[PDB]
Amino acid sequence: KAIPKDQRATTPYMTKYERARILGTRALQISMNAPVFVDLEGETDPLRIAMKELAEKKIPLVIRRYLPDGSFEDWSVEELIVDL
Amino acid sequence: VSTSTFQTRRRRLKKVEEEENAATLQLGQEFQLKQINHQGEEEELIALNLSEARLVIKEALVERRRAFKRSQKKTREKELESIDVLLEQTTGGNNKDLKNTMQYLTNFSRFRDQETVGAVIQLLKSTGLHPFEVAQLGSLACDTADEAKTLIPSLNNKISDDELERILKELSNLETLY
Amino acid sequence: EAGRAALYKEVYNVIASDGSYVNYRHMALLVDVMTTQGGLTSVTRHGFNRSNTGALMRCSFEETVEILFEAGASAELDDCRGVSENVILGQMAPIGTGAFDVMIDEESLVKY
Amino acid sequence: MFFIKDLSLNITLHPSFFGPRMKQYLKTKLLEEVEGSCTGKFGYILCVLDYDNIDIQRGRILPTDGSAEFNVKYRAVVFKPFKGEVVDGTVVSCSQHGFEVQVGPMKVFVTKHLMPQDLTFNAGSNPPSYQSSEDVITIKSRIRVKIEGCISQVSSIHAIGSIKEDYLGAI
Amino acid sequence: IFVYQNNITPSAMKLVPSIPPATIETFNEAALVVNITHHELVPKHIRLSSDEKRELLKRYRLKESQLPRIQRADPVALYLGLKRGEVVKIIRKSETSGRYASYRICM
Amino acid sequence: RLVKALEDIMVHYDNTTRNSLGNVIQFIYGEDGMDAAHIEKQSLDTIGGSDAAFEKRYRVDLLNTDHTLDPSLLESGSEILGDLKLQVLLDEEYKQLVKDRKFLREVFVDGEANWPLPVNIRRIIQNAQQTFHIDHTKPSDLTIKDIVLGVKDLQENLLVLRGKNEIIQNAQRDAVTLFCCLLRSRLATRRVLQEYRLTKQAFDWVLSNIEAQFLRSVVHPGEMVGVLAAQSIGEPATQMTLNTKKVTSGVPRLKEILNVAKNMKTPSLTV
Amino acid sequence: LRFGEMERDCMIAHGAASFLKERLMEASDAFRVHICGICGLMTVIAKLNHNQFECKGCDNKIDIYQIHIPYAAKLLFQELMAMNITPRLYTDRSRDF
Amino acid sequence: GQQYSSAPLRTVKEVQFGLFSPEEVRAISVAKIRFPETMDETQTRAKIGGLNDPRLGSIDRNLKCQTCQEGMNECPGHFGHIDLAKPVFHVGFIAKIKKVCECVCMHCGKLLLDEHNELMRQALAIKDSKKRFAAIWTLCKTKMVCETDVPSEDDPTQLVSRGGCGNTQPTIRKDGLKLVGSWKKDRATGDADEPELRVLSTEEILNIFKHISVKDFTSLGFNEVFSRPEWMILTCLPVPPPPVRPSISFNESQRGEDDLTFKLADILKANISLETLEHNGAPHHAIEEAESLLQFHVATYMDNDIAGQPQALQKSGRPVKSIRARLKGKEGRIRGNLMGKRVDFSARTVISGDPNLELDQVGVPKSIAKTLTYPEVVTPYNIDRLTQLVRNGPNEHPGAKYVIRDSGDRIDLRYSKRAGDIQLQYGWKVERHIMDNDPVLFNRQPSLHKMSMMAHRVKVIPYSTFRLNLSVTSPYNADFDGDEMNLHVPQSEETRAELSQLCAVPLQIVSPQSNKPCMGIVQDTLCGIRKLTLRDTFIELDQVLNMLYWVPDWDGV
DNA sequence: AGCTTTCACCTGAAA
DNA sequence: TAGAAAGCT
Numbered sequence A: 001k002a003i004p005k006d007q008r009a010t011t012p013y014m015t016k017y018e019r020a021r022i023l024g025t026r027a028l029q030i031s032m033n034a035p036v037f038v039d040l041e042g043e044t045d046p047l048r049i050a051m052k053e054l055a056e057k058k059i060p061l062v063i064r065r066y067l068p069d070g071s072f073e074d075w076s077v078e079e080l081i082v083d084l
Numbered sequence B: 001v002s003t004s005t006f007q008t009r010r011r012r013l014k015k016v017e018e019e020e021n022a023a024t025l026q027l028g029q030e031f032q033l034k035q036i037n038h039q040g041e042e043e044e045l046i047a048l049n050l051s052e053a054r055l056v057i058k059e060a061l062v063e064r065r066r067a068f069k070r071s072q073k074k075t076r077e078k079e080l081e082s083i084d085v086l087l088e089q090t091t092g093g094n095n096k097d098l099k100n101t102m103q104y105l106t107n108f109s110r111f112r113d114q115e116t117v118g119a120v121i122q123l124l125k126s127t128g129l130h131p132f133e134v135a136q137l138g139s140l141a142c143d144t145a146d147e148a149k150t151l152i153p154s155l156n157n158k159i160s161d162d163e164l165e166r167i168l169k170e171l172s173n174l175e176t177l178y
Numbered sequence C: 001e002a003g004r005a006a007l008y009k010e011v012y013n014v015i016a017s018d019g020s021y022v023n024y025r026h027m028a029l030l031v032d033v034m035t036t037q038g039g040l041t042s043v044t045r046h047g048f049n050r051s052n053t054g055a056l057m058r059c060s061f062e063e064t065v066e067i068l069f070e071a072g073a074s075a076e077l078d079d080c081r082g083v084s085e086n087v088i089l090g091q092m093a094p095i096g097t098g099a100f101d102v103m104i105d106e107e108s109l110v111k112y
Numbered sequence D: 001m002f003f004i005k006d007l008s009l010n011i012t013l014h015p016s017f018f019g020p021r022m023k024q025y026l027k028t029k030l031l032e033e034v035e036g037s038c039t040g041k042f043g044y045i046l047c048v049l050d051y052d053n054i055d056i057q058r059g060r061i062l063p064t065d066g067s068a069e070f071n072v073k074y075r076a077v078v079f080k081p082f083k084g085e086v087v088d089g090t091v092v093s094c095s096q097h098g099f100e101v102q103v104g105p106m107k108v109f110v111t112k113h114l115m116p117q118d119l120t121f122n123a124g125s126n127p128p129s130y131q132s133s134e135d136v137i138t139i140k141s142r143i144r145v146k147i148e149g150c151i152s153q154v155s156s157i158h159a160i161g162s163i164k165e166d167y168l169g170a171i
Numbered sequence E: 001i002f003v004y005q006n007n008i009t010p011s012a013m014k015l016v017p018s019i020p021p022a023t024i025e026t027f028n029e030a031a032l033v034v035n036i037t038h039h040e041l042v043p044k045h046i047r048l049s050s051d052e053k054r055e056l057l058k059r060y061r062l063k064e065s066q067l068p069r070i071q072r073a074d075p076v077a078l079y080l081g082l083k084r085g086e087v088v089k090i091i092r093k094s095e096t097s098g099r100y101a102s103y104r105i106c107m
Numbered sequence F: 001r002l003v004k005a006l007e008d009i010m011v012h013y014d015n016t017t018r019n020s021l022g023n024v025i026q027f028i029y030g031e032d033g034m035d036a037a038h039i040e041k042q043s044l045d046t047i048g049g050s051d052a053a054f055e056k057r058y059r060v061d062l063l064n065t066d067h068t069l070d071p072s073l074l075e076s077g078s079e080i081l082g083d084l085k086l087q088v089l090l091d092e093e094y095k096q097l098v099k100d101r102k103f104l105r106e107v108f109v110d111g112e113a114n115w116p117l118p119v120n121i122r123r124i125i126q127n128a129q130q131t132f133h134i135d136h137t138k139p140s141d142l143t144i145k146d147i148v149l150g151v152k153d154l155q156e157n158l159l160v161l162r163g164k165n166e167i168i169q170n171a172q173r174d175a176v177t178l179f180c181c182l183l184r185s186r187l188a189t190r191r192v193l194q195e196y197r198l199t200k201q202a203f204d205w206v207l208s209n210i211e212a213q214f215l216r217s218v219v220h221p222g223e224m225v226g227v228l229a230a231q232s233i234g235e236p237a238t239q240m241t242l243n244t245k246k247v248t249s250g251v252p253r254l255k256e257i258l259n260v261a262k263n264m265k266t267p268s269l270t271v
Numbered sequence G: 001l002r003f004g005e006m007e008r009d010c011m012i013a014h015g016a017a018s019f020l021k022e023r024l025m026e027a028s029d030a031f032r033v034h035i036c037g038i039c040g041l042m043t044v045i046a047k048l049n050h051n052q053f054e055c056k057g058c059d060n061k062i063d064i065y066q067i068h069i070p071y072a073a074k075l076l077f078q079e080l081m082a083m084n085i086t087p088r089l090y091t092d093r094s095r096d097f
Numbered sequence H: 001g002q003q004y005s006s007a008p009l010r011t012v013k014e015v016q017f018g019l020f021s022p023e024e025v026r027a028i029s030v031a032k033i034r035f036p037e038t039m040d041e042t043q044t045r046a047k048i049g050g051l052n053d054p055r056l057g058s059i060d061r062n063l064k065c066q067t068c069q070e071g072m073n074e075c076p077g078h079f080g081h082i083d084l085a086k087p088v089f090h091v092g093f094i095a096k097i098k099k100v101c102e103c104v105c106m107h108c109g110k111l112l113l114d115e116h117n118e119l120m121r122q123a124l125a126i127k128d129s130k131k132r133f134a135a136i137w138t139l140c141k142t143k144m145v146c147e148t149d150v151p152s153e154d155d156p157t158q159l160v161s162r163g164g165c166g167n168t169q170p171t172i173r174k175d176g177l178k179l180v181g182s183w184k185k186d187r188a189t190g191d192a193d194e195p196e197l198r199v200l201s202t203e204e205i206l207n208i209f210k211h212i213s214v215k216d217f218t219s220l221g222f223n224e225v226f227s228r229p230e231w232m233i234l235t236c237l238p239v240p241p242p243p244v245r246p247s248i249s250f251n252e253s254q255r256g257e258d259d260l261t262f263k264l265a266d267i268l269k270a271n272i273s274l275e276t277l278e279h280n281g282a283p284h285h286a287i288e289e290a291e292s293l294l295q296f297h298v299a300t301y302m303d304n305d306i307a308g309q310p311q312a313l314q315k316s317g318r319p320v321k322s323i324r325a326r327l328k329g330k331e332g333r334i335r336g337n338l339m340g341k342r343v344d345f346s347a348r349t350v351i352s353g354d355p356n357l358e359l360d361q362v363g364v365p366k367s368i369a370k371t372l373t374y375p376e377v378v379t380p381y382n383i384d385r386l387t388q389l390v391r392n393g394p395n396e397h398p399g400a401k402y403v404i405r406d407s408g409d410r411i412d413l414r415y416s417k418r419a420g421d422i423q424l425q426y427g428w429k430v431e432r433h434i435m436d437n438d439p440v441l442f443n444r445q446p447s448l449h450k451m452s453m454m455a456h457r458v459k460v461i462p463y464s465t466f467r468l469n470l471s472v473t474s475p476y477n478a479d480f481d482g483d484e485m486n487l488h489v490p491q492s493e494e495t496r497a498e499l500s501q502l503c504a505v506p507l508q509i510v511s512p513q514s515n516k517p518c519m520g521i522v523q524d525t526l527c528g529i530r531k532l533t534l535r536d537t538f539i540e541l542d543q544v545l546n547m548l549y550w551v552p553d554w555d556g557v
Numbered sequence I: 001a002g003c004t005t006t007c008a009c010c011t012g013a014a015a
Numbered sequence J: 001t002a003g004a005a006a007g008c009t
C-alpha cells in the first residue's frame, strides 16, 4: 500500500543482504559507465568506488522493504545505519 | 513498449466481445463517459472542439518553450506561420501529425479567443449531453436543429428542437469573424 | 503443544546420541513446521508435499507429473512466491538479496 | 471528438544517465516515443501536456543490468476517429475511384459511390475534379464527411466516408 | 457438559446439536481422572476475545489461514471448549528467550 | 526431504518466520530473534548455589553497618550509609534479582546454568578492565543511581521488535526476557563495585558495548532459515554414517521420526 | 560441470539471490520467448525483424510480452502442453495476499 | 545470441494451470498433421507438408521457420494438431473421469446429491477445491439412483421435487483404459441376480460431462474458464513441434527421428485406420477394435509406464519413452534439467593443500585460468589495462580470449585478423582471463552445508591441482587422497559482490549450524603448536629472528 | 468395516 | 528396496 516514513517499523540498520546488494548494484552501474557521486581518490575498481560511495552515504539508492502482506517501507542508503 | 491507461480490466482468457464503435455514443472501452484520472479519482471524459483543442495544444507547447528556455539557463493566415514557429521550437518535427493537426485546427477553428471558447463551453455544458455531442455541437456549425440532429444522430430525443435551435443561434453569435 | 515438545525431545535425542550439537532454533523450526498444520504433518511425499504451496514448487519433489496433471484439472494458480518456482522460471528469487527492491531517488541523485 | 486521455509509458534508462539531468532526459525520451505516436487503442497521440508537471515516480533498478524502469504517468491530446462521426476537412487527391479528404492528422477517403450519382468525375481538368449540376469538388476544396468505417494501420488510422446523405458534401 | 460413565448411544447423541445458541459437550469420565493441563509438556493456553483476535491479526498483518492451527479435537481445545475460529495464545518458557508467545486458531 | 520441506521459510521484515503461503511458522526467529552465529554459551550466575551465597553476592543494605558497600568501593560510601531513598533502589534491585532466580529455576528445571546467549558480557567487562587499567585498590566514581538506573536504561534499548503497540511491544519484552535475566545477574551494584571494580567511564563503556553487540546479534530479514535449519539437522545425520534401556537410535530413529511412523520399533513409557 | 539440486540449496541458504539466477540462466540454459497477454502461452508468431507479433486465436497484435526463462522451462511448458495441460504465464497478478 | 525484440520485457508473476479446450488446440495450431509420413517429399530430402513442418517448427538449420521467419535459435516450435476420429480418455484423467461419473447422473448430468441432503450441503461448504471434491465423491459414490423427488427441508410426508430423471446408476470399475459399469436392474423387484453389463463409450461420458451444469462442476474440482470436465477427454490432439521431438539428422541422407515422432506417427496411422473403417463398410467389431488401438497409442504417447502391463515397446524390444518419463525426477526436466543444470564458466580438478596460502585463497592452475573468462566493461578506469590484456593474447597468462563490441558480435582474439590492430571503445566487453584476487565459488559435493560452497580469492599457480588452505579443509569435508573440487566463476560485478559480501571464507568462520567456529588449526600445525608451547621449549636467537620475519604483520620489534 | 491391494529409494566424476 | 494410502471381499 506504502507505509509512511513516520509509521515505519523495520530495522533502522541495513541488512547484510541490502549492503551486499547496494554495493553490487553501484559496482555494476559504475562499471556500466554511470556517474560516480564521490571523489575517486585514485580508485579504479567499481566495487571499491561503490564502498566509497556507501561510506559517504552518497549513493542515491532506495531500499523498498516489502512485507509478508504486500505493503512496503522505503528507506534511503543515506539513512540506513551500517554497523556491518 | 507502448502506452497504457487508467482502465485496468483483466480479460483473463475470455477474449472479445469487440462491439463496434458508432455515434450511438458507443465509443471505445477507453472512451468511457465514466473514466479515471491518475490521481485515483473518477473523472468525466474530455472531449474538445476545434479551438478548445487548438488553444489546449498551443498553450501546452507555449509553456514547454517556457520550461525549455528556463532549463537552458544552466489573424488565421498569420496564426499559421506563428504556430509553425512554436512547433519548430518545441516538437520533434518528425511528428508530422501534430503539424497537420495544428494547420487543420488553425483553419477549421470556430472560436479565435480563450474568452469566446470559454463562453461557448458555458452555453454548451448547461445541456447535459455526452461530451462527444457537446464537443461536436461546438466544432460543427449547424442551422436547422435538423442539420444538427442529423450530423449528431446521438441527440435525436435528447433536446427540444427549439432549445437546440436556441443554442445554435447563440453559438452563431459567438463565431469570431476571422 | 505437548506433541511439539515430545517431537523435539525425540529429535534432539537423536542429534545428541552421536554426541553432536545442533543449536535449538534449527530443530525447533523443523518441529514447529511439522506441528503448525494442526497435527503431525510428516516430512514425506504425502505430508508436506500435500499442502497448498504452489504446483511448480510441489512438483519439484516426488509426484512430479501427477501433481502437474492435477494442477491442470483443478485449474491451480501459482503464486510464484516459492524459491523453486523462481528457479524453474529463471527469475531472481525473493531470497536474501532478492527480499527487497532497489530504487533511484532523483531527489537525492540531484542533492549530490 | 479530440480527447484528453491520462496515460503511462514504462521507460528503461541506461545507468550512464543516472546523473542529475535525469528527469530532463526521461521527459524528453517520453516525448520521443509517445508524441507523434499512433495506436489503434488511443488513436493519434499528438501532443503531451503539462511538461513541467510530468510524474516521474521512483525507478526500480533491474535485476541483472544497471538499467532502471520508470512508469512515467502523463496526460495528452488524442484524436481517435469513429464510425458515424461527421468531419469537416479539405480534399487532397482525386481519381475515378473518389477523393481523399484530410481531417486533422488522418485521411478519410470518399468513393465515387459514397457520393451522389449527379457528381461525376472529370479527368480533363487541372487538377482532377468532381463536377455536379451545382458545385465542383477539387484538390483544395472543403468538405463535411460522415465516417462510415475505420482501419487501425501502424502509423495511421485510415477511413472511408459518405457525402451522399443529407447535410453532407461540399461547404 | 455431560460427563458419561461408559457410553452415550448414537440415538441420544443426535440431540447434541438440537438447541442453538446453547452448546452441548460430552466428556468420558475416564479421560477426566487425570488433568492433561497439569502435565509438564502442556503449556498455558488462553482463549482470545473477538476483539483480542481482530487485534492479533491486524498487528501481524495476517489472514486467519496464515495462523498456526489447533485441531477442534485437541485435548486442550476440548478442555477450554474452543470453537471454530477461536484463537489460543500459547505461552511456553523458551531455552532461548525465557518466555515465548505462540498462537493457534481453531479448525 | 528436509530441505524440500523447509526451503521457502525465511525471516520477513517483521522478524516473523514464514513460508510461500506466508503462513507464520515462528512468530520471532528461534523464539529470541537472534542469529545463531552471534551466540556463545554464557553462565546464568543467578540460578545456582545456596540462597546464602546469592544473598552474599547480590545483597546491598545501606542501613546495616556490615552490609553497606565499604567506602573502599566508591567515594560515596561514607555519605551513602543509612540513605532510605537509595536503599529503596537497592531493595528494588535485590527484589528483582530474586524474582529473576525463581523464573530461571522455572525454565531450566535441572538447574543447568550454561546457556547459548548473545553478547559475551564476561569478555566485555574483561576487555573494559585492560582498556581502562582498573585499579583494584582505589574507589569508584560511580553512584548507586549510576549503576541501578543505567542498567535499567540499557535494557529499554536492547531492541529485537520495533512496532508501537501492546501486541508487538509485549512481544519485544518476551524476546529479551532471558538476556535481561543474565544482564541483571552480571550488572548488579555489589557485583559491579566489588568484583569488576569498574569506574564510571568503564561502566558507561560496558553499557554502550552490550547495546551495540546486542543489536549486531539480531537475525537479518531475508535470512534463509528454512534451508539453514534443514541442512543443520541434515549434515550431522550424514557424518553419523559416512565415517568409521536399548532403544532404536541414530539414522533409523530419525527416519522413524520424520516419516511420523505409527508402528514404531522400540515404543516405551517412562513412568 | 553440474550445479545440481544440492548446490542450488547452499546458494539459497546464503541469500546469493542473483548469483543463483546467474548460474541457472546466463551461465547455462537462458532463452527468450514471446508470450500472449490473453492466454499466457508461447503461441506468439514473433517476426522480430518486421516488428509484427501475433497470436491468431486471440487475434492479439498488441498485448505481447517478451520473457526470459531457462530453455528447459520453455521445453517443460511445450511438453506439458503436448499432454493437454495449459501452463498459462502471466506478467501481472490478481490474487494479492 | 538472440536478437532485439520490440515487445516489452516482463517476468512471470502467475502460472495459471488449466486444460486445453479442443477449440483452442485448433485455433493456436499452425498446421494439421494429416500424414504419418515424416518428411522426404516422396524420398526428396525436405520436410513433408503433412507431419514435422506442414508450417510447424523447422529442421534444416540452414532454413528459416515456415511461420515466424526466425529459424533455429530464436524460433521456439509452433504447435500442430490432429483431429482424432473418436474421442479418447487422457491417461492421467482416467481416474478423475471415473470419479466424475461416480458423482453425477449418467443420463441427465445433474449431481447425484444436492443442497436437499444435509451431509452434501456440509461437504459443499468446504472451501478447498480438492477437499470439497473429496467429500462430494465419497458421498455420491453410493447414491445409485438419480432422484426425481427428495424429502423436503422441513418434513418427510411432503417430499420436494428437485431435478428430474429417475434412472438407475451404473457401478463403474476400470478394465484398464476402458470404463465399464453394471446397472443394478429390477425384474420382479430383486434382480441382479444377473445385471446389465455394458461398457461406457468415451463419446457417451463426453456428452454426459457437457451437460454437467457450470454450478455443478464448479462444486466439483473444476473451473468454467480453464478446466471444464469435458476437456479431460481428448478430441483434438496437440502436435508438439521439433524442439520437443528433435530430428537428430546424422551425416546427410539419413534421418534420426525421436521416439515421440514415431509415437505420433503410430497415433496418426491408428487414426486413419479408424477414420476409413467407420466411413467405409463398418464391420462394427473392427471399429471398437481400431478405436481401442487409438486410445492405447494416445495413452502410451503421454504415459508408457501404465499398470495394465503391455509395455508398448519400440521394434527393438526397448519401450517407447513417454512425455511423462521425460519430466520424472532425479534426471529429467524438473529435477535434473531445471532444479539442477550443467553450467558454463566452471572448472574441476584434483585438490592438494598448501600451508603458504592464505585461508581465503585458492590455487588455480595457469591452464584453468587461461580457460576461464570474466566479461569486463571497457571503462576509462580499465581502458588501458584491458587493451594490454587484449594485446597479450589468449595464449599467455594475464590476457584475454574475446572482445565483444556494442555491435553484440564476438571478436575471437584467437584467430581474428585484427587481433593486434584492435583499439577498444567504452561500452565494449573484454572477456579476460581469471586473475589473482577475483572472487570464485569453490565446492565439494556432498554439499550438505551452507559451508560446502565458499567464495575464495584466485591466486594463479603452476601444476594441475587446485591448491586450498589446510584449515579450510574441515568445512568442505575435503582431504587430498584423490579428491577433486568444482570452481564456478561469477560473471557480473553484481554476482562478485554477492560472493565477496556474503559467501567468503572469512565470513563463514563461525558456524550458525552449531554456534561454534567451523574451521581451526589442523594436523601439522596442531601437532607442532603443542610441541612448540611446552614450558620446556626454547628457541635460539638465530631462529627467533626467522620465526619473527615469517609472520607477515610483525611490528619490526 | 479390517485385511487386501496398490503405489519414492545420497551428491558430484567416469566408460 | 519396505512402508503408507488408496480400495477390496
Ligand SMILES: Nc1nc2c(ncn2[C@@H]2O[C@H](COP(=O)(O)CP(=O)(O)OP(=O)(O)O)[C@@H](O)[C@H]2O)c(=O)[nH]1
Binding pocket: F242, H445, H446, H477, H478, H481, I010, I011
Ligand atoms: N555423499 C557421498 N560421499 C562419499 C561417498 N563415498 C565416499 N564419500 C566421501 O569420502 C570421504 C571418506 O573417504 P575414505 O573412505 O576414502 C576415508 P579414509 O579411510 O582414508 O580415512 P580416515 O577417516 O582418515 O580414517 C568422506 O568425506 C565422504 O564424504 C558416497 O557414495 N557419497
Ligand SMILES: [Mg+2]
Binding pocket: H478, H479, H480, H481, H482, H483
Ligand atoms: Mg578423500
Ligand SMILES: [Zn+2]
Binding pocket: G036, G037, G038, G039, G040, G041, G043, G055, G057, G058, G060
Ligand atoms: Zn493468445
Ligand SMILES: [Zn+2]
Binding pocket: H056, H057, H065, H066, H067, H068, H069, H070, H071, H075, H076, H077, H078
Ligand atoms: Zn517459427
Ligand SMILES: [Zn+2]
Binding pocket: H105, H106, H107, H108, H109, H110, H146, H164, H165, H166, H167
Ligand atoms: Zn438423471
